[PDB]
Amino acid sequence: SEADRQLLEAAKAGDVETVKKLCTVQSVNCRDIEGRQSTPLHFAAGYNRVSVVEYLLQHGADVHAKDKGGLVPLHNACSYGHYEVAELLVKHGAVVNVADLWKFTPLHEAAAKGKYEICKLLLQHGADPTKKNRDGNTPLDLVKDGDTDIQDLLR
């Protein structure tokens, strides 16, 4: 659908006014069929569009939606290091220990990317730093050797 394509794009662009105009029952959780099946909320989260994330969360977006690889919008926020988005998604019920297809959790992502505040957020909401992904790696295992502050945080 043409409105769907424009909504997904407005979410990436952070054009909240266009998002407001294009949001319908069906479009608010539509999927990018030719891409990774991301929803508007995956894109807003991944592109750090805080106002769009806030609007979507208030108007019918599913915080738990998975893309083709099993990523929820919290994974996108953590992977690209967007703290405010990660906090909003967690405050709105994102499951902090959710695993994608590869068994990576948001904390695996935040640890690998070395995002202090995001790791702190997830740990405070019960993120399990003992969880192994399919490489047998815990989030602590994914912290870069150069990233001393994150290592210490996760012990």
Binding site: K12, D32, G35, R36, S38, H42, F43, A45, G46, Y47, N48, D67, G69, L71, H75, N76, A77, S79, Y80, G81, H82, W102, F104, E109
Partner: peptide, 12 residues
């Protein structure tokens, strides 16, 4: 296949 991070962009 390589594991993909999902749709999004880095902050500056």
């Amino acid at each position: 296949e390589i594991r993909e991070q999902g749709d999004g962009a880095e902050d500056e």
